[PDB]
Amino acid sequence: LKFEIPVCTSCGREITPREHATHFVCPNCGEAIIWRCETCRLLAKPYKCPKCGWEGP
């Protein structure tokens, strides 16, 4: 079997091999993993947790 490519939480695009992305557990609930791509981090796009609904950088 193969491996799955991570996907940005905000824009839904895939993460390239050497970009300045990041990933961390949801601050409010701690149950989901948030991924942010380089463009979304640069432009300060808001993100929303899929489990608890808490949102925003």
């Binding site: 601050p27 409010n28 981090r41 640069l42 300060a44 925003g56």
Partner: protein, 196 residues
């Protein structure tokens, strides 16, 4: 309700902004006074402080780094590191601390706390390149670029920084289970602030 009474917040001067503003900071701005100075909303600060306190408690205690170039923030970060066991770097940030393995004090954290994105530009620039989450205190003047968790506050005053770091340390201790209640934390706020 609130971690501390709103009177204490207002006395510490947390709500006081600057003469400038930014488009992405307007989600936290409350109103603008007649002299052209902007004011922050204190309730958002309290909510974000609680969320950040929950967030930082899940990491390994000694993998947290806090930095401050400004003079008024050097004592609070040092005390915060002493209480919670996290590493603290006050004063000048040596370039290459996080990117040059040959340096004597090379160190790679898991999360970083920025007192002021404008003043600590070198630390933020190095933290971007290693892909770790970034927590920062933002004023009405700063931008939210490359910030993963923002805490709206006045990040230039003495009492304001002291109070913010005291609250954050207490919240971390409470969430990680080292104290059974909020009131058990018997350390005066004045011990966090620089004298004279």
């Amino acid at each position: 309700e609130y971690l501390v009474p709103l009177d204490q917040y207002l006395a510490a001067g947390v709500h006081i902004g600057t003469q400038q503003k930014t488009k992405d900071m307007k989600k936290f701005i409350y109103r603008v006074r007649q002299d052209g100075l902007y004011v922050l909303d204190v309730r958002k600060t309290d909510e974000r402080l609680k969320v950040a306190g929950k967030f930082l408690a899940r990491f390994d205690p000694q993998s947290i780094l806090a930095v401050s170039v400004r003079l008024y923030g050097q004592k609070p970060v040092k005390k915060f590191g002493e209480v919670t066991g996290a590493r603290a770097i006050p004063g000048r940030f040596l370039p290459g601390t996080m990117t040059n393995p040959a340096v004597k004090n090379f160190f790679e954290p898991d999360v970083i706390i920025i007192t002021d994105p404008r003043a600590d530009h070198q630390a933020m620039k190095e933290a971007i390149e290693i892909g770790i989450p970034i927590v920062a205190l933002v004023d009405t003047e700063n931008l939210l670029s490359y910030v993963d968790l923002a805490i709206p506050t006045n990040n230039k005053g003495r009492k304001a920084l002291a109070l913010i770091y005291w609250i954050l340390a207490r919240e971390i201790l409470y969430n990680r289970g080292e104290i059974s209640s909020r009131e058990e934390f018997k350390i005066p706020v004045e011990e966090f602030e620089m004298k004279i």
